[PDB]
Symmetry: C3
Subunit: 51 residues, 3 copies
Amino acid sequence: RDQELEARLVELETRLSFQEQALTELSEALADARLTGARNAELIRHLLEDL
Amino acid sequence: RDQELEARLVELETRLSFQEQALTELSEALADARLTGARNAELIRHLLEDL
Amino acid sequence: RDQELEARLVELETRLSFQEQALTELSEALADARLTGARNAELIRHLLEDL
């Protein structure tokens, strides 16, 4: 009758699944942001020079 | 006497809670960073043009 | 014979460990990205002024 433990496992599994998905999305978005940062930095270095 | 399992559940629950909180904070900070990137890109596109 | 529960715990522990590691790496990378954003913004503010 100790199925309290299994219900909790099911809850943690579910939470963990959402976390995993969130993480993947945050990694993708950050990879893109970092590339934009890198590009911007390089554009700026140039503008600085042409002045 | 197999309460070893429940202690472990409690540990994972706790770990998961900190992860969730961390994720939320990282999402907020990234959303802000991305907007700054977007703004910067647009400012730069202009400077490039006015030169 | 209900060792099904322990195997699941072991799986969640393992998943959680990878998540934790991923999070740490994403936090580091974001901290760096944000600093680059901050720098870029300030470089740009200046260029805007010198024009």
